[PDB]
Design a binder for this molecule. Structure first.
Ligand SMILES: *[C@@H]1O[C@H](CO)[C@@H](O[C@@H]2O[C@H](CO)[C@@H](O)[C@H](O)[C@H]2NC(C)=O)[C@H](O)[C@H]1NC(C)=O
Ligand SMILES: *C1O[C@H](CO)[C@@H](O)[C@H](O)[C@H]1NC(C)=O
Ligand SMILES: *[C@@H]1O[C@H](CO)[C@@H](O)[C@H](O)[C@H]1NC(C)=O
Ligand SMILES: *[C@@H]1O[C@H](CO)[C@@H](O)[C@H](O)[C@H]1NC(C)=O
Ligand SMILES: [K+]
Ligand SMILES: [Mg+2]
Ligand SMILES: [Mg+2]
Lengths: 693, 614, 362, 233
């Protein structure tokens, strides 16, 4: 193994994996390890040297600030502001010159994954045969003429890699060949939501359907890198992904024939399209569960070309079979792109295009008959290489790299959840506003504004202090405000409980259930959120039917700083706010800030106002948290996990009214739902929610 | 008893046109019908209104007419303006113009490289329009109806004809247009600018003096250039340049400065015959290279007129007619050889013992007393600058002719404006002076006057006259509407039969009619800096902006839009052709750009073209 | 009147283009563009007349037009690493060229000798712009000499020493330009360099496609024993396309390049080329690298390299030798008996065996 | 070593000849004197130069107003000035002559690097940037030649970066070099007279223009045909 002398990273930590033959650097949120995230153990007992993209040696590893690519140019317009580099949460806006019209996102925000939100801004005078292709941020474009058969080329600043097409040509049909380019840095990644949407949208046509020829057929080839570089953990993760993909595909009612291949030095063909059972999802799934990483332990090189030749061989024929030109082919490749034997795999792609007669007859290009998707797996992904194999289609994405394997799994978990009914708790498909928070309820009481969460067809969960025909409730972002039937306060609640002790508001057990008079109709914008210690949440977290309430709590609320979120209305717009629940070593200091709250000046021991029912967010450690507004009170405190939304607390009260330069003692307190479960279980017993205890 | 109709001698389509109808010797209230028909067939009624003429209004009406371009299209067009009512029938055929207003083109730069967009705006002085691009060979390659709110960039091809392109903006059916230019060249922006300062703005054709050009070379960020300059002098004869090869000189550019010299001896050896020089200009071609040879700039000092005097005298601002027995106002206009006004120059007409010195606008008004019996008036003016020999003084002669009175009546009118360098906000005394028969003059109860600006009747008024007063004074308040100049036309009538008229041309200080200033902090900035500027202007102004690398102007600065180009273009389009008065009553109207008809058939003659003769 | 219907059919698109030309739009020229050179079918129906112009632009096979210029640089002894720069120029016109300019850039890290420049600047016929001096060096990396004229009948020559101001890894060629006032059009430029006859950076061209050959030389790798695991890792980098055992058949020369003709004996690690043993492989280098590569005809070599270094040579496989190219001498069968090569041979056999049998490790 | 880290040097690249082609409306309340103001924020482009901001306004009663130019002067105390030729020819070695300006009134030691670009043959390589270090006197300039061979037709960035030892000053410039194919651009001119009445069948004229005869042509260089139609008066 390799000595750990001088491996440390300035600003972060490291953790050895695969028992010491590879190490991973860990950086605080908003930061990333420069120049690389993972190192490998060399034969010489020395760790792989730190290399930039230019293959320039770096002497010291350090945690560096995340930046979104700077614009290198923007045609026929201006943008604001112009900076050397753009920080996470920074905003940039574009404006066209006179005589040009803006397409894409006028306002774009720098996100923590190093990407700008929205779509490329383009200022276009609509003069070209084709439209103005634009300049994705971080690229430079060469070519400003947009006539039939004109081309433009793109490049990224060395240090970054070009994903997508480096050259695009204006075609007879009015569109640009290939696909819009982007700039990829080492820390950049796709969110699981983005990938699910991009892939499913590419694969299907929109509910959704997979499209095939009249009297048509489909072949899907699952190709999994099982070389030494990949590792056992990611390999098995990749397996699960494929198992779930098979389920997703089956929902569409088509019967694809599968190919199943794992490879290292050599390919191992587990299923061939020519087998009778190859269209048998349960068969294919069974075989998939057979694969063992040890199967390529001895001959563990990376001959991606040979793997792809196995796909080609499955497609080829002894004259061509009836209806050969009718079948649609989908290659699902999972690899880190670090091929090292057999040469450039792209040459097999070209052979396959030749075999299927794709891109030969301009009167019938046949590009619809082949899709190559590549998902980056393994600790170090080579972007240039995975991009080279992936299809390049206008307005589609075929190449994906997520943060890690847990995130890759979430992609496929979300796809399976997509099909199911609307009653599926805490599930959002990222295509509006209530589309993004369909659990959200606005509560209005008129007296001479609170929030809530939908938890079933009859019930809205909110804060008890919101109250005392007066009470109206609205959901789905509708003008329609619903009639209620009765409000159930937690039986232990009493806001004036400590009045005589000089404590005017006592927020303990600050939760209330609103029963609607009529049942909610679930839809795009009205959906329930998962609650703790229910079957729904056991399933949301992908756990077994034997999971216990204590096991849910350990998963959702560990004794640590817990990333969470709440929904705030800012100018009639719902928006997600990322906060940290201090449930570990910081809990005490978060809680003690309670004694600076208004009314609490006489309080001698904060346990008098902060009880065991409370969760605490806000402040500056570990990060500067946003604070709740008065309007947000009663709303859900949410944990986003395995692609699902699970409510863990109800927004109750805050130390400082900051509705920036917010003070460090500005904490928010929320009722811990794990702490009021018996009331919850009892009151919602007839709602089909399936509580445990 | 005397009914009169006065219109602009040229009417524009699609725009407010005041006309003037008057009844003299009639105090009976009348409803008048006003028509406009196409001429000669009167196929349609282009315009129609009805007006009330009553005593309360001085029996004077100023209806506004408007001729829609769309009703009178298809290929000189005329209209007939007709006024009818009880005892009233007047008719006047008037030339039509399709130039509804004045258009001006702004492009983002004066020079472009192949494969790049030409951005442009079209402005109109009064807020349709055709925009055309032509190649340097004169080929029309783009033609579009544009809305004055949204313009379409012209994308230059990569394989493109090099040279000077034209953009033309025009109202459809109009032989007039506004043309702007841009160069298309394979160029890169230089890193520095070259400024040239001639020793004099002119060169004496038969002088002894040498000529110098001082060179200043500065990087565009502000610092001094070190290098070398190659200067070649020559004489530009029309289009062709005839160089002086032995004048080619190489001089150091140190700390940004240098001086090149053309020796008189060298000039004479090359151009011994003075005839070849008359009317022509000296130029100096200046090519500067930085000391390291990394960059070069070529510019030229041109338009150095080769002359016998530093000044020119012009009579273009003085009437060519006079009123016998009344003082004649002689406006003398002195310019430099390039036509900029020459201030503080003494002038003299010796025969009249008249002296004056020109003001900042280059003019000096001299008053000449004219004997009652004169019918012709020879005048000679010369500069009398103290630093010049007589031979270098500029001189010029003219002959003014006596206004011929109607029927030999001996009745005259003279409008006198004594004020100088007139500016908006001013209060200008206007003097009405009458001369003639005692019995005729006692009949005068009022003067009618019209203010003409940019081809239109802008205001009409009445000035009362109490008997006894051979001098009557009125105050005229000058507003920005009278920029860049106006005409004051006036007349009286005698016995419902005789009309006596005069006019004056009055220059106004050329500025914007409104206000527009760009204010900033004036500090030196770093590349990529956040800027703030304030735009200050009139409420509701639409402001087109652009930021240009000063380096662009180094390559080309000839074609830029400016206020002076605006005013100059407008003045060149004036419908009046002279500086005032006239050969007779009708002459005064015609020469001022007005048409006249009366119930006694006193009619101005038909106008040839919209354009005043050369 | 004038009423023309024009149809243009181009092969590059299904939908023909149609114009009507009448009195109203007659002045407007209409243009269509295609990036092909194919048949064009044009149809005209109606009353009027028009002129159609077809312009075909292309690059045809074809500067130092109005001046001749020779430049050379030589070593000289100063008792330094001084050089002697020599420049000769003549005008090709019919009279002497007035106001001529000789525009000189220094080799990287060199400056003109101050005494020589001062000597040169003398005369009622020349001018050299102001320069500071330090350590007998004129502080000008670009030096311009302005001549009142240059002869059209006889060469005008000048020379001066250039001295080393600072050191660099590699010295960039300098250049000399000549032009004059009435011919500022003239592109006349020559480069110079102490190690190159014509001051040209090393490149290797196949027809019109050139590749940068590098100014640094690759050298034959020598190792008395091979650390086999380490060697395997190097061979198994993702940018290593193939690993061969070759024999060198011939050394050829052309355009100042060596062509090392290799026969591929064994594919140790299969690359992009599917049948390398079928065809002979040319490995191309600059003759400057001859000595350092030290290859021997009929010797065997371990060679691996990148797909990037493939050259566009038709009907042969050719690579440019670069820093990504690994070349190592592989002992002959009979050499494997000497104790000098015994263990090295074992190492080569183990390297070969591991790769061919198990492949790369990851 | 005493020099600015390369990654901390953000190269200047946005060098437009004209920009800010926008229109603003004086929407604000007139002051006591009839004048309405409008405060306007923007960022400068990258050039070290003087910009001239030109405003032209129109209001229904005030006609057209052209404002006096407002100059913005841009400067750094230490920077690279890079004059590029309009175009250069593929495969032909050329020298690019950058100038380094020291407007600091003190002597400095500097590092200058030419970035590697696969489109050029230069002293830089993928593994190693071509680097020099040398003094510059107070308030002086220094020519810094770079020799390159363009290997690809089209537009390709040249990028130079420089910094001063033990000071903050640095500058980088990235500028496009225009590379044209070798040989000379020729045109074949074919004139066809369209005149269906005199040349057609039933008032219809059909012309077929064959592929033009070329191939004295530089291999793999582009070809463009323009078909221009001009009606006769
Ligand atoms: C991102 O964050 C940095 C601060 O770490 C901002 O830095 C600017 O640039 C330098 C510091 O590197 C300072 O001279 C500037 O003054 C900083 N900005 C300011 C205060 O004007 C950088 O601007 C940020 N990017 C943004 C906010 O767009
Ligand atoms: C240039 O050519 C001439 C021959 O015409 C030769 O004598 C001279 O040495 C050359 N000059 C050089 C290489 O400096
Ligand atoms: C962009 O942001 C501004 C506020 O900064 C907002 O007024 C504008 O509407 C936004 N444009 C959008 C949302 O399209
Ligand atoms: C514009 O006016 C002048 C008149 O000679 C000239 O430039 C040209 O004839 C006109 N252009 C038009 C009407 O297209
Ligand atoms: K010159
Ligand atoms: Mg691998
Ligand atoms: Mg004026």
């Amino acid at each position: 193994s390799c000595s750990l002398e001088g491996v440390e990273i300035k600003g972060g930590s490291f953790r050895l994996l695969q028992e010491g033959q590879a190490l991973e650097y860990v950086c605080p949120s908003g930061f990333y390890p420069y120049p690389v995230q993972t190192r490998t153990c060399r034969s010489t007992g020395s760790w792989s040297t730190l290399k930039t993209q230019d293959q320039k040696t770096v002497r010291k590893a350090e945690c560096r600030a995340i930046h979104c690519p700077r614009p290198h140019d923007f045609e026929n317009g201006e943008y604001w502001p112009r900076s050397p580099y753009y920080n996470v949460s920074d905003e940039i806006s574009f404006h066209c010159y006179d005589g040009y019209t803006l397409r894409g996102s006028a306002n774009r925000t720098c996100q923590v994954n190093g990407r700008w939100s929205g779509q490329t801004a383009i200022c276009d005078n609509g003069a070209g045969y084709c439209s103005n292709p634009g300049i994705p941020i971080g690229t430079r474009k060469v070519g400003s003429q947009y006539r039939l058969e004109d081309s433009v080329t793109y490049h990224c600043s060395r240090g970054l890699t070009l994903r997508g097409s480096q050259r695009r040509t204006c075609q007879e049909g009015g569109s640009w060949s290939g696909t819009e380019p982007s700039c990829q840095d080492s820390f950049m990644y796709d969110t699981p939501q983005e990938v699910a949407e991009a892939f499913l949208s590419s694969l299907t046509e929109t509910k959704r359907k997979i499209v095939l020829d009249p009297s048509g057929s489909m072949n899907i080839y699952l190709v999994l890198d099982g070389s030494g570089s990949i590792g056992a953990s990611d390999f098995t993760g990749a397996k699960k992904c494929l198992v779930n993909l098979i389920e997703k595909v089956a929902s569409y009612g088509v019967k694809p024939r599968y190919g199943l291949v794992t490879y290292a030095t050599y390919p191992k063909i587990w299923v061939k399209v020519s087998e009778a059972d190859s269209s048998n999802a349960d068969w294919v799934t069974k075989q998939l569960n057979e694969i063992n990483y040890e199967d390529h332990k001895l001959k563990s090189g990376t001959n991606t070309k040979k793997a792809l030749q196995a796909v080609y061989s499955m497609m080829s024929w002894p004259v061509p079979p009836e209806g050969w030109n009718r079948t649609r082919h989908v290659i699902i490749l999972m690899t880190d792109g670090l091929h090292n034997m057999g040469g450039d795999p792209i040459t097999v792609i070209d052979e396959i295009r030749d075999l299927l007669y794709i891109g030969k007859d301009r009167k019938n290009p046949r590009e619809d008959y082949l899709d190559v998707y590549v998902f980056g797996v393994g600790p170090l992904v080579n972007q240039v290489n995975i991009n080279a194999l992936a299809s390049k289609k206008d307005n589609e994405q075929h190449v994906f790299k997520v943060k890690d394997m847990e995130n890759l799994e979430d992609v496929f978990y979300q796809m399976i959840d997509e099909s199911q009914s609307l009653s599926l708790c805490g599930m959002v498909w990222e295509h509006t506003d209530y589309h993004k928070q369909p659990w959200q309820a606005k509560i209005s009481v008129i007296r001479p504004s609170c929030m809530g969460a939908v938890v079933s067809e009859y019930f809205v969960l909110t804060a008890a202090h919101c109250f005392t025909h007066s009470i109206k409730v609205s959901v789905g972002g509708e003008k329609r405000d619903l009639e209620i039937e009765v409000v159930l306060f937690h039986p232990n609640y009493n806001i004036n409980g400590k009045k005589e002790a000089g404590i005017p508001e006592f927020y303990d057990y600050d939760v209330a259930l609103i029963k609607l008079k009529n049942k909610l109709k679930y839809g795009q914008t009205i959906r329930p959120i998962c609650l703790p210690c229910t079957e729904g949440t056991t399933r949301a977290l992908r756990l077994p039917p034997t999971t216990t309430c204590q096991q849910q709590k350990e998963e959702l609320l560990p004794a640590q700083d817990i990333k969470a979120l709440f929904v705030s209305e800012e100018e009639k717009k719902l928006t997600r706010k990322e906060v940290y629940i201090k449930n570990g070593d910081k809990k005490g200091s978060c809680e003690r800030d309670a004694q600076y709250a208004p009314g609490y000046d006489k309080v001698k021991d904060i346990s008098e106002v902060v009880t065991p029912r409370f969760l605490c967010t806000g402040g500056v450690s570990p990060y500067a948290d946003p604070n709740t507004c008065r309007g947000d009170s009663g709303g859900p405190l949410i944990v986003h996990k395995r692609s699902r939304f699970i409510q863990v607390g109800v927004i109750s009260w805050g130390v400082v009214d900051v509705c920036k330069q917010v003070p460090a003692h500005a904490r928010d307190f929320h009722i811990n739902l794990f702490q009021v479960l018996p009331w919850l279980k009892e009151k919602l017993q007839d709602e089909d929610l399936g509580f445990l205890a | 008893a005397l009914y009169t109709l006065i219109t602009p001698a040229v009417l524009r389509t699609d725009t407010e046109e005041q006309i003037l109808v008057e009844a003299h010797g009639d105090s009976t209230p009348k409803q008048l019908d006003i028509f406009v028909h196409d001429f000669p067939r009167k196929q349609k009624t282009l315009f129609q209104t009805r007006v009330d003429m009553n005593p309360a209004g001085g029996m004077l009406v100023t209806p506004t007419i408007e001729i829609p371009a769309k009703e009178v299209s298809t290929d000189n067009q005329y209209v007939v303006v007709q006024v009818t009512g009880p005892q009233v029938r007047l008719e006047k055929v008037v030339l039509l113009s399709y130039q509804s207003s004045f258009l001006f083109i702004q492009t983002d730069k004066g020079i472009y490289t192949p494969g790049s967009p030409v951005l442009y705006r079209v402005f109109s002085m009064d807020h349709t329009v055709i925009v055309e691009f032509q190649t340097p060979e004169g080929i029309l390659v783009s033609s579009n109806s544009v809305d004055l709110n949204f313009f379409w960039p012209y994308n230059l091809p990569d394989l493109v004809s090099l040279g000077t392109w034209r953009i033309v903006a025009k109202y459809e059916h109009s032989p007039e247009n506004y043309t702007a230019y841009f160069d298309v060249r394979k160029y890169v922006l230089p890193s520095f600018e070259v400024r040239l300062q001639p020793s004099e703005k002119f060169f004496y054709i038969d002088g002894n003096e040498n000529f110098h050009v001082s060179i200043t070379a500065r990087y565009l960020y502000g610092e001094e250039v070190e290098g070398v300059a190659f200067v070649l002098f020559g004489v530009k004869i029309d289009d062709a340049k005839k160089s002086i090869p032995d004048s080619l000189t190489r001089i150091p550019i140190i700390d940004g400065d240098g001086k090149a010299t053309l020796k008189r001896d060298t000039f004479r050896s090359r151009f011994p015959n003075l005839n070849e020089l008359v009317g022509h200009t000296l130029y100096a071609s200046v090519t500067v290279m930085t000391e390291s040879g990394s960059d070069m700039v070529v510019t030229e000092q041109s338009g150095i007129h080769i002359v016998a005097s530093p000044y020119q005298i012009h009579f273009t601002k003085t009437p060519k007619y006079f009123k016998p027995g009344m003082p004649y106002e002689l406006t003398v206009y002195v310019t430099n050889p390039d036509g900029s006004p020459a201030a503080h120059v003494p002038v003299v007409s010796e025969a009249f013992h008249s002296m004056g010195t020109t003001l900042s606008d280059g003019t000096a008004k001299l008053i000449l007393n004219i004997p009652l019996n004169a019918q012709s008036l020879p005048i000679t003016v010369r500069t009398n600058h103290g630093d010049l020999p007589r031979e270098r003084q500029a001189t010029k002669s003219m002959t003014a002719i006596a206004y011929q009175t109607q029927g030999g009546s001996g009745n005259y009118l003279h409008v006198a404006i004594t004020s100088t360098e007139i500016k908006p906000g001013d209060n200008l005394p206007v003097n009405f002076n009458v001369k003639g028969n005692a019995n005729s003059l006692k009949q005068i109860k009022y003067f009618t006057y019209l203010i003409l600006n940019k081809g239109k009747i802008f205001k009409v008024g009445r000035q009362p006259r109490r008997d006894g007063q051979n001098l009557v004074t009125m105050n005229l308040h000058i507003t920005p509407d009278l920029i860049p100049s106006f005409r004051f036309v006036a007349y009286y009538q005698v016995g419902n039969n005789e009309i006596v008229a005069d006019s004056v041309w009055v220059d106004v200080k050329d500025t914007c009619m409104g206000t527009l200033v760009v204010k900033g902090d004036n500090l030196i900035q770093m590349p990529g800096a956040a800027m703030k500027i304030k735009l200050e202007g009139d409420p509701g102004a639409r402001v087109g902006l652009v930021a240009v690398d000063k380096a662009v102007y180094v390559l080309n600065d000839k074609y830029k839009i400016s206020q002076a180009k605006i005013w100059d273009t407008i003045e060149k389009s004036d419908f009046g052709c002279t500086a005032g008065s006239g050969q007779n009553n009708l002459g005064v109207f015609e020469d001022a750009g007005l048409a006249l008809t009366t119930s006694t058939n006193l009619n101005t003659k038909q106008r040839s073209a919209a354009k005043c003769p050369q | 009147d004038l009423n023309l219907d024009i149809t243009i059919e181009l092969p590059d698109r299904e939908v023909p283009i149609r114009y009507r030309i009448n009195y109203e739009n007659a002045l407007l020229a209409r243009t269509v563009e295609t990036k092909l050179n194919q048949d064009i079918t044009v149809t005209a129906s109606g009353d009027g007349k028009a002129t159609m112009t077809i312009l075909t632009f292309y690059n045809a096979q074809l500067v130092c037009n109005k001046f001749h210029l020779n430049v050379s640089v030589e070593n000289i002894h100063l008792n330094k690493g001084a050089l002697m720069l020599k420049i000769c120029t003549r005008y090709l016109g019919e009279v002497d060229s007035t106001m001529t300019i000789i525009d000189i850039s220094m080799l990287t890290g060199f400056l003109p000798d101050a005494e020589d420049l001062t000597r040169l600047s003398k005369g009622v016929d020349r001018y050299i712009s102001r320069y500071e001096v330090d350590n007998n060096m004129a502080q000008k990396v670009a030096v311009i000499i302005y001549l009142n004229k240059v002869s059209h009948s006889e060469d005008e020559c000048l020379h001066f020493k250039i001295l080393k101001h600072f050191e660099v890894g590699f010295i960039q060629p300098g250049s000399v330009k000549v032009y004059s006032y009435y011919n500022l059009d003239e592109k006349c430029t020559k480069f110079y360099h102490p190690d190159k006859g014509t001051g040209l950076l090393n490149k290797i061209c196949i027809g019109n496609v050139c590749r940068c050959a590098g100014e640094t030389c690759s050298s034959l790798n020598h190792q008395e024993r091979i650390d086999v695991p380490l060697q395997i890792e190097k061979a198994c980098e993702t940018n290593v396309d193939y690993v061969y055992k070759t024999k060198l058949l011939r050394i050829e020369e052309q355009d100042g390049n060596d062509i090392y003709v290799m026969d591929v004996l064994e594919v140790i690690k299969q690359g992009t080329d599917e049948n390398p043993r079928a065809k002979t492989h040319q490995y191309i280098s600059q003759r400057k690298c001859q000595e350092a590569l030290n290859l021997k005809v009929n010797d065997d070599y371990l060679i691996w390299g990148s797909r990037s270094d493939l050259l566009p040579t038709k009907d042969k496989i050719s690579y440019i030798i670069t820093k990504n190219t690994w070349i190592e001498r592989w002992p002959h069968e009979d050499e494997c008996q000497e104790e000098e090569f015994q263990k090295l041979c074992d190492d080569f056999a183990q390297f070969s065996y591991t790769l061919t049998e198990f492949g790369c490790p990851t | 070593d005493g020099f600015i880290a390369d990654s901390d040097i953000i190269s200047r690249s946005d060098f437009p000849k004209s920009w800010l082609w926008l229109t603003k409306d004086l929407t604000e309340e007139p002051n006591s004197q009839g004048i309405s103001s409008k405060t306007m924020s923007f960022y400068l482009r990258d050039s070290i130069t003087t910009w001239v901001v030109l405003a032209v306004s129109f209001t229904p009663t005030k006609g057209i107003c052209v404002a006096e130019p407002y100059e913005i002067r841009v400067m750094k105390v230490f920077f690279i000035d890079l004059q590029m030729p309009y175009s250069v020819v593929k495969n032909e070695q050329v020298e690019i002559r950058a100038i380094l300006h020291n407007y600091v009134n003190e002597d400095i030691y500097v590092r200058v690097e030419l970035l590697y670009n696969p489109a050029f043959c230069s002293a830089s390589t993928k593994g190693q940037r071509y680097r020099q270090q040398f003094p510059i006197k107070a308030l002086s300039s220094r020519a810094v030649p770079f020799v390159i061979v363009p290997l690809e037709q089209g537009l390709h960035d040249v990028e130079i970066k420089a910094s001063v030892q033990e000071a903050l000053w640095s500058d980088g410039v990235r500028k496009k070099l225009k590379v044209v194919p070798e040989g000379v651009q020729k045109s074949i001119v074919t004139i066809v007279k369209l005149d269906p009445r005199a040349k057609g069948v039933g008032g219809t004229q059909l012309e077929v223009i064959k592929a033009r005869k070329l191939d004295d042509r530089v291999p793999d260089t582009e070809i463009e045909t323009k078909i221009i139609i001009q009606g006769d008066p």
